[PDB]
């Protein structure tokens, strides 16, 4: 009989950096997703497994809600089969993804005059992430043959960079909050 706590993920006051994206596990509750989809407050609401107005009518063993912040131009990377710094190095959806991608502009909350430098993303990585891999490493990146031994320098880079979110950014460079719902003995139903 109990309601899935989608509010505390969508309405959380603080969101994770994309490289350290948060995962919430929705289990043992009832979910009304047409209330999310009827919100009409999301610039992105693309579902990949089955119709969004037709998903209040199904059951799943486990629902995962992943959430993070990225820049606007990068929201398109949060979809199956994409490439780029986010999809390759930060958060990677599988090619056979079934689920929904929801996003909205968060310029009012996550940008600051002077620039908000708290949101970070992974800039350097030797190889692409597997689907749903979370790399929280801050080891210095070795771009040449000499080991870095924890010292930044030539061929030795800190692997993370911060988005400088300012409210005068173009919308492509403004912060967007993203929630990814993936659908995995039923525990959650409509």
């Amino acid at each position, epitope marked *: 009989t109990n309601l899935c706590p989608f509010g505390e993920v969508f309405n959380a006051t603080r969101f994770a950096s994309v490289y350290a994206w948060n995962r919430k596990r929705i289990s043992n509750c009832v979910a009304d997703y047409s209330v999310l989809y009827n919100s009409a407050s999301f610039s992105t609401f693309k579902c990949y497994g089955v119709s969004p107005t037709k998903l209040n009518d199904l059951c799943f063993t486990n629902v995962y809600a992943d959430s993070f912040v990225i820049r606007g*131009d990068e929201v398109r990377q949060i979809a199956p089969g994409q*490439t*780029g*710094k986010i999809a*390759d*190095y930060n958060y990677k959806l599988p090619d056979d993804f079934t689920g929904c991608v929801i996003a909205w502009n968060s310029n009012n909350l996550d940008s600051k005059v002077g*620039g908000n430098y708290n949101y970070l993303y992974r*800039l*350097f*990585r*030797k*190889s*692409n992430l597997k689907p749903f891999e979370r790399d929280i490493s801050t080891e210095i990146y*070795q*771009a*040449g*043959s000499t080991p870095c031994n924890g010292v930044e320098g030539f*061929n030795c*880079y800190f692997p993370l*960079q911060s*988005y*400088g*979110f*300012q409210p*005068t*950014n*173009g*919308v*492509g*460079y403004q912060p967007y909050r993203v929630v990814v719902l993936s659908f995995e003995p039923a525990t959650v139903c409509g």
Partner: antibody
């Protein structure tokens, strides 16, 4: 030392194809972002293509569908395969090590490509 | 498609002057901008990245400054070897150079 040397440029006819090579020293090509940049006679720099260390590739609209960037880790060498060349592809071609946010710090001396009937 | 416009295309000045080169973005792009120098017949050189960060080993008279929509590159006291062309560049899944600014000797 640190070095990029680009070879393979020469004269080729419109519609033909040509492969450029860029041999690096002092950093690991497959570990880095790598760009090709070109400059037509008397004109500005034009970015051409980039390869990510993880293998993703991107192209300027003016070469999309015709150029392919790639690398060979065992030769520490970067390649640009150029098909369906056109006269306006005539330029000096440079490769650079690309630090992304941090900019392109290491450049080659360039190789010249001439496309003409 | 953000458009970069660099101005002026030609700038005449003399040794010791303070020169200011501007790059204007059609939309606020934060710090996603870099500056390059090119001397004739030679490869580009990186000067500044992330708008205001001076690349290592580049003389301190070079400095950059940017709001998001207006970026300038400032040579505080022009040296004889600073006569050259300067290009601004914007990036993210692509790289785009500005048309360039040629700094020439005033007379």
């Amino acid at each position: 030392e640190v070095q990029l040397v680009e070879s393979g440029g020469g004269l080729i006819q419109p519609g033909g194809s040509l492969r450029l090579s860029c041999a690096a020293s002092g950093f690991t090509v497959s570990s880095n972002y790598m760009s090709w940049v070109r400059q037509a006679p008397g004109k500005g720099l034009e970015w051409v293509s980039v390869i990510y260390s993880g293998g993703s590739t991107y192209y300027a609209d003016s070469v999309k569908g015709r150029f392919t960037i790639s690398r060979d880790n065992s030769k520490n060498t970067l390649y640009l395969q150029m098909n369906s060349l056109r006269a306006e592809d005539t330029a000096v071609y440079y490769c650079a090590r690309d630090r992304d946010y941090y900019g392109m710090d290491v450049w080659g001396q360039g190789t010249t490509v001439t496309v003409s009937s | 498609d953000i458009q970069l416009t660099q101005s002026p295309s030609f700038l005449s000045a003399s040794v010791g002057d303070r020169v200011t080169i501007t790059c204007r973005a059609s939309q606020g792009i934060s710090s996603y901008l870099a500056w390059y120098q090119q001397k004739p017949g030679k490869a580009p050189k990186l000067l500044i990245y992330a708008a205001s960060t001076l690349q290592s080993g580049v003389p301190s008279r070079f400095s950059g400054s940017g709001s998001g929509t207006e970026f300038t590159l400032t040579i505080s006291s022009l040296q004889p070897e600073d006569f050259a062309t300067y290009y601004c560049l914007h990036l993210n899944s692509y790289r785009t150079f500005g048309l360039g600014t040629k700094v020439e000797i005033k007379r």
